[PDB]
Enzyme design. Structure first.
Site, PDB file in Angstrom:
ATOM      1  N   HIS A  61       0.745  -1.224  -0.167  1.00  0.00           N
ATOM      2  CA  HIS A  61      -0.047  -0.145  -0.175  1.00  0.00           C
ATOM      3  C   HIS A  61       0.734   1.394   0.058  1.00  0.00           C
ATOM      4  CE1 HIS A  61       0.506   0.606   4.430  1.00  0.00           C
ATOM      5  NE2 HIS A  61       0.160  -0.560   4.373  1.00  0.00           N
ATOM      6  N   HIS A  91       6.945   7.192   5.331  1.00  0.00           N
ATOM      7  CA  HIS A  91       6.246   6.687   3.948  1.00  0.00           C
ATOM      8  C   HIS A  91       5.612   7.970   3.153  1.00  0.00           C
ATOM      9  CE1 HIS A  91       3.263   6.281   7.039  1.00  0.00           C
ATOM     10  NE2 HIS A  91       2.231   6.431   6.366  1.00  0.00           N
ATOM     11  N   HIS A  93       2.278   9.246   0.286  1.00  0.00           N
ATOM     12  CA  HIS A  93       1.013   9.047  -0.272  1.00  0.00           C
ATOM     13  C   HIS A  93       1.002   9.806  -1.375  1.00  0.00           C
ATOM     14  CE1 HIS A  93      -0.749   7.015   3.366  1.00  0.00           C
ATOM     15  NE2 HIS A  93      -0.216   8.017   3.773  1.00  0.00           N
ATOM     16  N   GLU A 103      -3.282  13.719   1.368  1.00  0.00           N
ATOM     17  CA  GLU A 103      -4.199  13.013   2.362  1.00  0.00           C
ATOM     18  C   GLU A 103      -4.888  14.418   3.097  1.00  0.00           C
ATOM     19  OE1 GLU A 103      -2.760   9.756   4.762  1.00  0.00           O
ATOM     20  OE2 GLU A 103      -3.729   8.570   3.251  1.00  0.00           O
ATOM     21  N   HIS A 116       4.880  11.319   5.412  1.00  0.00           N
ATOM     22  CA  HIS A 116       4.568  11.078   6.602  1.00  0.00           C
ATOM     23  C   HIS A 116       5.760  10.496   7.500  1.00  0.00           C
ATOM     24  CE1 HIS A 116      -0.077  10.816   5.830  1.00  0.00           C
ATOM     25  NE2 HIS A 116       0.453  12.109   5.993  1.00  0.00           N
ATOM     26  N   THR A 195      -3.756   6.914   9.120  1.00  0.00           N
ATOM     27  CA  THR A 195      -4.772   6.844   8.003  1.00  0.00           C
ATOM     28  C   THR A 195      -4.828   5.937   7.045  1.00  0.00           C
ATOM     29  OG1 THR A 195      -2.945   7.775   6.416  1.00  0.00           O
ATOM     30  CG2 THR A 195      -4.131   9.511   7.498  1.00  0.00           C
TER      31      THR A 195
END
Length: 257
Positions: A61, A91, A93, A103, A116, A195
């Site tokens: 993910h 990591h 997103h 996010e 993050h 999240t």
């Protein structure tokens, strides 16, 4: 079987993780017209000089850059925090397009990606105990916009080919996370959650106001990762972001005027 796909995306997560509809879910939209300056916030202290990265992992993910967290090597203190929080991993997103990927949003603006840096409160002894506490984690969030390259990101980009698919890891030593920070440490803060599942409400969020720039080429390489394992149908790892959740009975505070 949660993910970001057609049938298992954020809107489905509540079925297996009912806290997805909880009181303190993340991310949120940061409304700069209602966030209030809090003069009793302190500057953040980011102490990453002794950071020991170890490995990078595609978990299906995102990818995590992992650190040695068995001593106070890379810590976050100050700001809204009481005590010492140790860096465990970072990591990102990101989107399939440059107009989406973050996010958190700022006045409803979506950035191309969001970083993050995850830290756990040393009073709780390990990460797994920390995530069971309301003040267990501190996540430093940093927006990414597409423009000029970020030199300090290139070593991450460099290695992505080696972890294309889910479950692949590679040694990743001597990476300096200071190369991912913007100039300013001005921030917004609020109480929230992880999240991704399990969506635990254990996070003091610290979201930097100043984005970092990355290049098109850098972002494009993130978009070549795969959600799938090797030898499965290719599905590009893009749009691995949860949308904004209701603020509910929370206030966002600013460290700056």
């Amino acid at each position: 079987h949660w993910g970001y796909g057609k049938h298992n995306g954020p809107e489905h997560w509540h079925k297996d993780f009912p806290i997805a509809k909880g009181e303190r879910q993340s991310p949120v939209d940061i409304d700069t017209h209602t966030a209030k300056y809090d003069p009793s916030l302190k500057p953040l202290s980011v102490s990453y000089d002794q950071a020991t990265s170890l490995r990078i992992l595609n978990n299906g993910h995102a990818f995590n850059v992992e650190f040695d967290d068995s001593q106070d090597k890379a810590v976050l203190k100050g700001g809204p925090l009481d005590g010492t929080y140790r860096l465990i991993q970072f990591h990102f997103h990101w989107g399939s397009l440059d107009g989406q990927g973050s996010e958190h949003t700022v006045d409803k603006k979506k950035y191309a990606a969001e970083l993050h840096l995850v830290h756990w409160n040393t009073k709780y002894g390990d990460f797994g105990k920390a995530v069971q506490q309301p003040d267990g984690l501190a996540v430093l969030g940093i927006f990414l916009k597409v423009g000029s390259a970020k030199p300090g990101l290139q070593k991450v980009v460099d290695v992505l080919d080696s972890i294309k698919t889910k479950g692949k890891s590679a040694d990743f030593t001597n990476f300096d996370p200071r190369g991912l920070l913007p100039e300013s440490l001005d921030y917004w803060t609020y109480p929230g959650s992880l999240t991704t599942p399990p969506l635990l409400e254990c996070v003091t969020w610290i979201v930097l106001k100043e984005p970092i720039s990355v290049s098109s080429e850098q972002v494009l390489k993130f978009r070549k990762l795969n959600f799938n394992g090797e030898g499965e149908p290719e599905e590009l790892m893009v749009d691995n972001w949860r949308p904004a959740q209701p603020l509910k009975n929370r206030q966002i505070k600013a460290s700056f005027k």
